[PDB]
Design a protein around this ligand. Sequence first.
Ligand SMILES: CN1CCN(CCCN2c3ccccc3Sc3ccc(C(F)(F)F)cc32)CC1
Ligand SMILES: CN1CCN(CCCN2c3ccccc3Sc3ccc(C(F)(F)F)cc32)CC1
Ligand SMILES: O=C([O-])C(=O)[O-]
Ligand SMILES: [Ca+2]
Ligand SMILES: [Ca+2]
Ligand SMILES: [Cl-]
Length: 66
Amino acid sequence: EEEIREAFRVFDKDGNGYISAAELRHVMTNLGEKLTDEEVDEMIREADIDGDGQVNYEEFVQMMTA
Ligand SMILES: CN1CCN(CCCN2c3ccccc3Sc3ccc(C(F)(F)F)cc32)CC1
Ligand SMILES: CN1CCN(CCCN2c3ccccc3Sc3ccc(C(F)(F)F)cc32)CC1
Ligand SMILES: O=C([O-])C(=O)[O-]
Ligand SMILES: [Ca+2]
Ligand SMILES: [Ca+2]
Ligand SMILES: [Cl-]
């Protein structure tokens, strides 16, 4: 799905292949959804299968399609 690859690029602000909690928080704020660190940390932990504290593309697709 190409829409999913685009949405990943949107969230991965610095393009380094990982969505950090700070990127996620800033994007949600751009969308008008103001979230706390505790909140975006929890969303990340739910998707973070390899436990590195970030969401890579492999993790992102699993989350978006399961
Ligand atoms: C794709 N994305 C994933 C999950 N869902 C909704 C989750 C949050 N959501 C929400 C929560 C409670 C009641 C209504 C809505 S709709 C909505 C609209 C915009 C956003 C905004 F602006 F924050 F993105 C978030 C949401 C649909 C949107
Ligand atoms: C179940 N189905 C797929 C999953 N969810 C989205 C859950 C969290 N999600 C979210 C929630 C509210 C509004 C937008 C988004 S998009 C998004 C982007 C990255 C992550 C990150 F970085 F944490 F993975 C999690 C999310 C919506 C519907
Ligand atoms: O931002 C908040 O406080 C929330 O979503 O509960
Ligand atoms: Ca990044
Ligand atoms: Ca990870
Ligand atoms: Cl804070």
